[PDB]
Design a protein around this nucleic acid. Structure first.
Ligand SMILES: COc1ccc(C[C@H]2NC[C@H](O)[C@H]2OC(C)=O)cc1
Ligand SMILES: [Cl-]
Ligand SMILES: [Cl-]
Ligand SMILES: [K+]
Ligand SMILES: [Mg+2]
Ligand SMILES: [Mg+2]
Ligand SMILES: [Mg+2]
Ligand SMILES: [Mg+2]
Ligand SMILES: [Mg+2]
Ligand SMILES: [Mg+2]
Ligand SMILES: [Mg+2]
Ligand SMILES: [Mg+2]
Ligand SMILES: [Mg+2]
Ligand SMILES: [Mg+2]
Ligand SMILES: [Mg+2]
Ligand SMILES: [Mg+2]
Ligand SMILES: [Mg+2]
Ligand SMILES: [Mg+2]
Ligand SMILES: [Mg+2]
Ligand SMILES: [Mg+2]
Ligand SMILES: [Mg+2]
Ligand SMILES: [Mg+2]
Ligand SMILES: [Mg+2]
Ligand SMILES: [Mg+2]
Ligand SMILES: [Mg+2]
Ligand SMILES: [Mg+2]
Ligand code: NA
Ligand code: NA
Ligand code: NA
Ligand code: NA
Ligand code: NA
Ligand code: NA
Ligand code: NA
Ligand code: NA
Ligand code: NA
Ligand code: NA
Ligand code: NA
Ligand code: NA
Ligand code: NA
Ligand code: NA
Ligand code: NA
Ligand code: NA
Ligand code: NA
Ligand SMILES: [Sr+2]
Ligand SMILES: [Sr+2]
Ligand SMILES: [Sr+2]
Ligand SMILES: [Sr+2]
Ligand SMILES: [Sr+2]
Ligand SMILES: [Sr+2]
Ligand SMILES: [Sr+2]
Ligand SMILES: [Sr+2]
Ligand SMILES: [Sr+2]
Ligand SMILES: [Sr+2]
Ligand SMILES: [Sr+2]
Ligand SMILES: [Sr+2]
Ligand SMILES: [Sr+2]
Ligand SMILES: [Sr+2]
Ligand SMILES: [Sr+2]
Ligand SMILES: [Sr+2]
Ligand SMILES: [Sr+2]
Ligand SMILES: [Sr+2]
Ligand SMILES: [Sr+2]
Ligand SMILES: [Sr+2]
Ligand SMILES: [Sr+2]
Ligand SMILES: [Sr+2]
Ligand SMILES: [Sr+2]
Ligand SMILES: [Sr+2]
Ligand SMILES: [Sr+2]
Ligand SMILES: [Sr+2]
Ligand SMILES: [Sr+2]
Ligand SMILES: [Sr+2]
Ligand SMILES: [Sr+2]
Ligand SMILES: [Sr+2]
Ligand SMILES: [Sr+2]
Ligand SMILES: [Sr+2]
Ligand SMILES: [Sr+2]
Ligand SMILES: [Sr+2]
Ligand SMILES: [Sr+2]
Lengths: 337, 53, 132
RNA sequence: CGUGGAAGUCUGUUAGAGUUGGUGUCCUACAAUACCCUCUCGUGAUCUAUGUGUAGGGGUGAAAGGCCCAUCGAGUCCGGCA
RNA sequence: GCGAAAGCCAAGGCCUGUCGGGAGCAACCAACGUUAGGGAAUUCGGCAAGUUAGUCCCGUACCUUCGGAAGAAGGGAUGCC
RNA sequence: GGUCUUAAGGUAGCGUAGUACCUUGCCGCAUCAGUAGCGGCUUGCAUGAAUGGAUUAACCAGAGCUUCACUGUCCCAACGUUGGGCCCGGUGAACUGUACAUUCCAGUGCGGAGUCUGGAGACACCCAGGGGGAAGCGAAGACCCUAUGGA
RNA sequence: CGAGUGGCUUGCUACCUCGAUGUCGGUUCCCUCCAUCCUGCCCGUGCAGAAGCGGGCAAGGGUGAGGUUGUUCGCCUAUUAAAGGAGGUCGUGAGCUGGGUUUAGACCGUCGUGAGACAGGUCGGCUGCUAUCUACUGGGUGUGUAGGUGUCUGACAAGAACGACCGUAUAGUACGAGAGGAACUACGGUUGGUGGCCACUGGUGUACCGGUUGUUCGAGAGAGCACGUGCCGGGUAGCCACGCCACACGGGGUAAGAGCUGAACGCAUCUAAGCUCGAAACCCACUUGGAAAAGAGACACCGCCGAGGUCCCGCGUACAAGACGCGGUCGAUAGACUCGGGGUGUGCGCGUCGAGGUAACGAGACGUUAAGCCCACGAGCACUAACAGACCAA
């Protein structure tokens, strides 16, 4: 009676088209629990290596034993939060109210933005505080950029600007915490937000594969047996039934595959350090040498080497945090071989 | 550990262990060493190998 | 079942001819089904190291031949991954005949066994000469 | 044991003849029957050139209603005929 | 080399099986190479592909019209100096 | 039934057959499982002796089945090679065209609508794609019936 | 016995199509229905337990692999939580297949005087087209909103992004004479699906290095050809799966159901008003798209004689055109060179040895030599090339 089979590919990551921004944009942020703090960071993908680790999990029979774990090295230098945007609760959702900028700007920020020459940080701050008194303040987020100049392997000097939410205690205290970061010069590190052993959500724009067929793009079968020799090898059986007399958008067709934004959940941060400890011999293939602030993410991370990946504390963790894993060995072996 | 074929140190979290019919065990560092062994070649006869030099 | 403590790339399929690593009288075993398995459309049901499989006897003694018995996969050619990242592969594909209570049908086991099979099936371990 | 060298004999893309499968390529074709691989026969009832004979209810046919100039369960042309 | 066989090369002929330029040159198609473990589970059907292979030595079953079956099968050998 | 039609009344053999409706007949072989195949039985819907019966070594691009070997046929797909495909110069057709035409879901209608009715959706143009629809294109249906048609 | 619903079977009719709407079965790919096979939640029991039987809500997900047969159907095997049924022109031939039905060849049986027939069997027996419109998957150019850069909002839109199973502790416990034998909960794993990634394993790798057969360049050295690598062995980057990583909980409101308070009807009553609960199902949560949302959006800064953009040039984290992204001397963007990191496996020449051979000659061995050759990666390095210069724009 012709067997059942789940459909080819997911209908939840659509439409499968080229991403608008290469810089990922989070659609969700964590809950306001503890102390005030920025709800995310960002870095550049370097490559992969393996690490030998001591099993942290109290429920595993292998607790205390040596375990090899795959790791994606991501260079995470200090970023600069140049402003504080505030949102107001309107009957049409959340709309931006005002922004509080600075005086101290990075030498090459004028490659992307039209840097502020004349701004009033006090009138903006006053408008935000009047809104809080009125009970109209939505959420508080920071306009943040990266310093690609600090990373020698990434060719670009032009900063990657992104907005990041501040969550925490009361709305009064986090407004003050946000202003304190900005007023200095905006400099903050991975250490300020993340601790090794916590679960992070990494977002990234995938490796672009251009146009590919239904077999690669949707995971459909190739024509089997005799059918594979008739002139049709990698084409689907039919575009649909007689009725409805149209092709449904749910049928697996050709098109753009890759270069899509993905938000990969519950990625463990194995180690956050600085220096050249995770660098591979001969350099990372198609990237270069690492000698500076880094992060070691458990397993795979979306996007190719040199691409900007975004970090955010896990919005939906399954496991409890087992802080600072004992890193017995980090491989430095050549990736060429 | 050390490669039972060439003699170089097997990088941890890498390699393959071949279990022979009699129960004997052979740790290999790479595919190159496995393939040379399958050709009936003995490690000490090949100049690139650490056992030979 | 209980965790093996190793990632297995199932090297056998339904219909595969494997060795019977024991003295039951059965020499060659043919895989029929894999316990607790449910595949997907067009996929050949796969068996690997540590799996309890339903088997038929292809070669052996007259009384043992043609019988439909249960067995446990002890060795396989396709590699398995141990927690330390190292891969472990065998010379042949082998299984030991087992009963309803998971105790080996024979008395002696021929050739090596993987430590993961030994941990899962206890009475098969306390019959194993070599555990690699 | 040797000699001898028979055969609608065997192997063979020798030349040559044939045309099994791919239901591949082509299918407004290179081609109104093509291309490629595969396959059969290849000293005989063999293949082949040229010359010559048999003519339409008639030939020719190891017979398929096959073939008789892309035309065949009765060729083609023109006429009967508007 | 058994060879009017293959492959390679002369003599002789040709670059006229007569449109070119560009993109590591994507999907898809035609021809095709290689694919771990499994090994016909594919399909009406092993269709397609593959396996085997030359030569010498050993050896060779049922059946048979005594001709044959038969290169049955199976086993070994093979270069250079 | 223990002759009658219409002369005789099926002998050797073979037999569930490329002939057996029942039918996947029953038993056995083989397989985990075999409407297959082979053997045996066989009352044969409706076998049978030059309408030739049976049998058979050799032969076969003939039909069916089993085994060893082999393998991308499959699990389940990947990467590569060559020619296209895509962009540029030059050359340059055809098929097809009542009109209108951005459609979709329902309905209605000669009962199988892009065009009617109600709603929904819909800014224009262009490139590439695989072919869902135009009961797509191609052919005055070969089937069937009809004609005081033909051969 | 009576009353119906459906439109899957069959039959009936002859409305539509005979200037043609291509068959059955299969396949592939998409959507759907519920009369639910499993999974969630429930009621009853001839419900001790365990395992069942029967019924209700419920279509989120799942419902698989094989042997005979063209088969659909069905029979059979082993697995499984279960291996449900049905619609979409008996979905699907401008997608495939062509085994069956149903052309022309042939045989057998039956019937026929015969040609020939058969709702009998059997062997063989072809699969056309360059997409105009529409539809959808992806990619651009314009116009609208009405100078630019960067950051956002969220009307709507899509999702199964998760489904299911095994095991351990609970526990040899509750229950039961015994046999037998649970659960809540907490854990570990497997399977199917999903998205992404290549450190590891594996494949490829007509880059590259080596071995070697035949032939040609006289030998040597070094090379060409042998199908687009002669063959064999190894294999970097990349691309990949057979490899690796990630994919909740919880809220809210309900269905079946369990109840509370409560009247009509002084009592009773889960319901009539009101209320507490309660499904894998619904909404939220989470992921993806989304200023063309015509109410055509918001914020900050820059600018209107100049902000910004295009062309150009060197290149890819991008790519079929177009698009996208980066660098452009205040520079490491690309190449050369040199290192580093890698592949192969020890170069030519020379020396010694070498079975023998008068000698000539001599396959080959050792040394020189971790040699020679090679690199789609990295670093250093402005040597070379990113020069020169043009245009638009409130
Ligand atoms: C299965 O037996 C069949 C019988 C007839 C047809 C064709 C007819 N059906 C639709 C039209 O009446 C006609 O279409 C055509 C001729 O193209 C197809 C199969
Ligand atoms: Cl197919
Ligand atoms: Cl199974
Ligand atoms: K018709
Ligand atoms: Mg690598
Ligand atoms: Mg390695
Ligand atoms: Mg199938
Ligand atoms: Mg003549
Ligand atoms: Mg005839
Ligand atoms: Mg293979
Ligand atoms: Mg099948
Ligand atoms: Mg063949
Ligand atoms: Mg019989
Ligand atoms: Mg007679
Ligand atoms: Mg007609
Ligand atoms: Mg007729
Ligand atoms: Mg007549
Ligand atoms: Mg049609
Ligand atoms: Mg119901
Ligand atoms: Mg559904
Ligand atoms: Mg149909
Ligand atoms: Mg169609
Ligand atoms: Mg067709
Ligand atoms: Mg076509
Ligand atoms: Mg047939
Ligand atoms: Mg037939
Ligand atoms: Na074709
Ligand atoms: Na159709
Ligand atoms: Na004689
Ligand atoms: Na032919
Ligand atoms: Na013949
Ligand atoms: Na005539
Ligand atoms: Na007769
Ligand atoms: Na292939
Ligand atoms: Na179409
Ligand atoms: Na009815
Ligand atoms: Na069909
Ligand atoms: Na359901
Ligand atoms: Na079946
Ligand atoms: Na139809
Ligand atoms: Na069909
Ligand atoms: Na067709
Ligand atoms: Na709920
Ligand atoms: Sr954002
Ligand atoms: Sr959003
Ligand atoms: Sr075809
Ligand atoms: Sr329609
Ligand atoms: Sr002959
Ligand atoms: Sr011949
Ligand atoms: Sr044919
Ligand atoms: Sr052609
Ligand atoms: Sr043709
Ligand atoms: Sr072929
Ligand atoms: Sr006339
Ligand atoms: Sr010449
Ligand atoms: Sr010309
Ligand atoms: Sr190779
Ligand atoms: Sr088969
Ligand atoms: Sr089969
Ligand atoms: Sr031999
Ligand atoms: Sr008789
Ligand atoms: Sr096309
Ligand atoms: Sr319902
Ligand atoms: Sr149920
Ligand atoms: Sr049917
Ligand atoms: Sr039947
Ligand atoms: Sr169907
Ligand atoms: Sr046919
Ligand atoms: Sr039939
Ligand atoms: Sr008659
Ligand atoms: Sr018939
Ligand atoms: Sr207008
Ligand atoms: Sr239990
Ligand atoms: Sr007990
Ligand atoms: Sr060549
Ligand atoms: Sr060969
Ligand atoms: Sr209720
Ligand atoms: Sr707008």
């Amino acid at each position: 009676p012709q067997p059942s089979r789940p459909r080819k590919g997911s209908l939840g990551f659509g439409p499968r088209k080229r991403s608008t921004s290469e810089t990922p944009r989070f659609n969700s942020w964590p809950s306001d629990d503890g102390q005030p703090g920025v709800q995310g960071f960002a870095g550049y993908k370097a490559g992969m290596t393996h690490v030998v680790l001591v099993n942290d999990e109290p429920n595993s029979p292998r607790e205390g034993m040596e375990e090899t774990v795959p790791v994606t090295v991501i260079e995470t230098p200090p970023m600069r939060a140049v402003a504080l945007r505030a949102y107001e609760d309107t009957p049409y959702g959340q709309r931006p109210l005002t922004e509080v900028w600075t005086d101290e700007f990075h030498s090459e920020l004028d490659r992307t933005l039209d840097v502020p020459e004349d701004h009033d940080p006090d009138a903006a701050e006053e408008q935000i505080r009047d809104a809080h008194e009125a009970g109209d303040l939505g959420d508080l987020r920071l306009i943040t950029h990266t310093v690609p100049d600090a990373v020698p392997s990434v060719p670009k000097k032009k900063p990657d600007v992104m907005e990041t939410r501040v969550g925490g205690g009361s709305v009064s205290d986090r407004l003050d915490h946000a202003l304190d970061i900005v007023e200095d010069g905006g400099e903050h590190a991975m250490n300020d937000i993340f601790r090794a052993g916590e679960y992070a959500d990494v977002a990234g724009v995938t490796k672009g594969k251009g146009t590919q067929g239904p077999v690669k793009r949707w995971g459909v079968q190739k024509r089997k047996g005799k059918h594979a020799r008739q002139g049709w090898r990698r084409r689907i059986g039919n575009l649909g039934p007689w009725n409805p007399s149209r092709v449904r958008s749910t049928v697996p067709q050709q098109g753009q595959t890759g270069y899509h934004q993905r938000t990969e959940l519950n990625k463990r941060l194995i180690d956050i350090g600085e220096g050249d400890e995770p660098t591979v011999d001969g350099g990372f293939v198609n990237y270069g040498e690492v000698d500076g602030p880094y992060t070691l993410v458990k397993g795979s991370v979306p996007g190719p080497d040199k691409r900007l990946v975004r970090f955010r504390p896990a919005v939906r963790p399954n496991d409890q945090p087992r802080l600072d894993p004992e890193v017995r060995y980090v491989s430095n072996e050549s990736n060429q071989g | 550990r050390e490669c039972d074929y060439c003699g170089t140190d097997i990088e941890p979290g890498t390699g393959t262990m071949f279990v022979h019919k009699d129960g004997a065990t052979t740790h290999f560092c790479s595919s190159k060493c496995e393939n040379n062994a399958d050709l009936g070649r003995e490690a000490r006869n090949l100049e690139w190998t650490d056992t030979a030099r | 079942m209980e965790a093996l403590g190793a990632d297995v790339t199932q090297g056998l399929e339904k219909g595969s001819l494997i060795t019977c690593a024991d003295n039951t009288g059965a020499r060659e075993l043919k895989v029929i089904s894999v316990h607790g398995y449910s595949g997907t459309k067009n996929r050949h049901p796969k068996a690997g190291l540590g799996d309890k499989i339903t088997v038929s006897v292809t070669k052996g003694t007259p009384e043992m031949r043609r019988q439909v018995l249960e067995a446990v996969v002890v060795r396989q050619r396709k590699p398995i991954r141990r927690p330390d990242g190292t891969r472990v592969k065998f010379e042949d594909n082998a299984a030991v005949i087992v009963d309803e209570n998971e105790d080996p049908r024979g008395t002696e086991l021929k050739g090596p066994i993987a430590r993961e099979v030994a941990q899962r099936f206890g009475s098969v371990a306390s019959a194993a000469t070599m555990i690699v």
